[model samples]
Target chain A: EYFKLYTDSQFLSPYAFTVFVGLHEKQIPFEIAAIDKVPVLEHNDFALSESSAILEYLEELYPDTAIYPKDIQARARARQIQAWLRSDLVALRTERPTDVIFIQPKSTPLSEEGKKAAEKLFFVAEKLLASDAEFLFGSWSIVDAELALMLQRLIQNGDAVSERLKNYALQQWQRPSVQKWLALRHKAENLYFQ
Target chain B: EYFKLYTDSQFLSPYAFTVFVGLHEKQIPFEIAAIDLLTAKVPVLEHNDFALSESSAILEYLEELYPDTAIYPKDIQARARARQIQAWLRSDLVALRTERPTDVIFIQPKSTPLSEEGKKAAEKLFFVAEKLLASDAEFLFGSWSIVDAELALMLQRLIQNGDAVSERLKNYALQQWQRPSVQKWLALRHKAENLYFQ
Candidate 1:
């Protein structure tokens, strides 16, 4: 079955990036649609929107390379974290836009609200990553990719992240799929923003 | 396995309501803790001492714990659609959420015009609903799911104010709201005094 991904390139859409990485990690063949709206995933006659939904659909479709955790509780935690990230953290997302991460030196001081958001972000990260485990749940999962991208938004902009988190973010960032996204992101940045 | 739900009863928090209905529909024995604030601005689900926040998380937890009465659709695509609707309701529709808070819905305040942004949000909501709910489909994705409860509450917020919603959506909202679990929620809302946007 063929898969087509619709996404925006000019603005760094993290949701789009998350789905793209999922497809890439699973070695799934898919085409890209550089649209300026919600990330749309099309397969055969069906088209699905919403990042989490698309990811879940792909996970079910390709169960071999599972992005979700094996344990039910861990899977619940993964879904919880993904949903929380999708819904909350408004201040940070607004202040530290993903575009700034791709384009160099687009850094600015955080506002009061942004600082508060950063504090909360770090608080949750520190709590979840308290141990020196490799991933959030000891093995690489889709939640790691989502969290790593969010942290990169801050880390790329010179925001201070804990040593553990910095290392985790870097580890995920080095993945081939993430590297592919970065390459595409840089291309988009140079072509449009420049 | 025992369950405890931490939430406020005075106001109609859609997220909290989602989990509440799930627990009730599943016939899971759970206790409610009227708490002021949760860590994530959402309801907290405590199983023994292990507490979890985020409404979707709680719903999934209950579904896993009690699989007999499934809250999600069995079909993969339908399940994906339900998750999409739930996530969309939680994150988007900001204008509708901001202008028409749940408090007003409970009190049934005098009819006030929806803001321009609120109308736009309602339009987007109706468009999606119209696409998903066919002429005869009972819920968002056939049989009752958590997405139906969330969407029902959202429509109730507009419906109570006599806002412009499609006849189809209005009928769907009323139908879902008449469910045993939803009726339970409405009964509780009637018993409690109005929080008045607290």
Candidate 2:
């Protein structure tokens, strides 16, 4: 049996949590490792840091579930969305680092330029999410997993400002899997990070 | 024979181009399509838009070209580096957009941010690139592949700002990047539309 070490933070982080839930739904077997540092994904043979890479690795390792989709173009589009989310939209983390798990003493406001950047990201997210498909790559895949993580953070951290993201979260929360993951993480004993 | 479409834009723009170039370098037969309009990869049977899904598809496909040493990480450390590049560094595109906005977004070295946040990111970029190059790997991997493509836009865009990226490895990366295919497409920017898609 292959033992896996995944931090609850990322395992339950927006995107990663969804992936873990999805993997579980599919009956993939792995163990959880709790650590004091930031969340990461580790396996007996390999360890990975980024949520995106973890999603990619899982898809590669478990080709049967086909989380990434089989079509060449579908894979590319998935990567494109992943790229966009990583590059264009998620830069908000630098401006607002607090995750949904906690509240800051006092929220720091975005700089004039930061606000402008936020607006642009909001537009991009809205445009992509509003696409005809239910998910970024049509059916749920790594792209969805990636966005779910950011969406979770956005809703939790941007309660005051991320209007479009809030709406998106409402839709995502309705999904049974996402709801389940949140419940589990909230219920977990080691919820706090060092 | 596979066909590809792309243009010289950084971040999301260079994605499709990188896939196309990757295909070509592997000696896979393919055609080049215009950016943003249509391409052979579009309307793939299972995908909403073939062009839209080009990047991951090309990466996952390309079975003929063994995984021997593609730009993808072949070892644990290499994989970690690749993941870091894909995650942290790739996300920096937004930072670039905010700090270095230009009519040509990929043209690099934005208007320069004098703010505190901007200064922090500038320092981060300096340290990250230097350390990234310090690794034993030649290209982003031992060769110029997709990972190189991922980083290429920044170099192309930042060419004008000499001091913007003062990393020695940048020069090494640039020298290799000046290869015929890369140099040719980069040069095309002068007369081409800055359109690209992943």
**For every model shown, what is its TM-score relative to the native structure?**
0.92, 0.63
DockQ of candidate 1 relative to the true structure: 0.62
DockQ of 2: 0.31
Task: Please list the residue runs of candidate 1 whose C-alpha ends up more than 4 Å from where it truly belongs after superposition.
Answer: A104-107, A186-194, B108-112, B190-198
DockQ for every prediction shown: 0.62, 0.31
Stretches of model 2 off by over 4 angstroms after superposition: A1-12, A26-39, A71-180, A189-194, B1-17, B28-49, B53-84, B101-115, B135-137, B152-159, B164-167, B191-198
Instruction: Report the C-alpha lDDT of model 2 over A1-194, residue by residue, as the tens digit.
Output: 47464554434344456456556645677766544423366666665666666666666566687777566655665665665555444346556553543444236655666566566656656666664456765676655656656555545665454555665556656676666665665556555542
Interface RMSD of each: 2.0, 4.6
Q: Which ten residues in a row have the lowest lDDT in candidate 2 chain A?
A: A97-106
How far is B198's C-alpha from truth in model 2 (Å)?
A: 28
In candidate 1, what are the lDDT values of residues A19-83, reduced to their tens digit?
99999989999988686537889998888889988988898899999988898777887888888
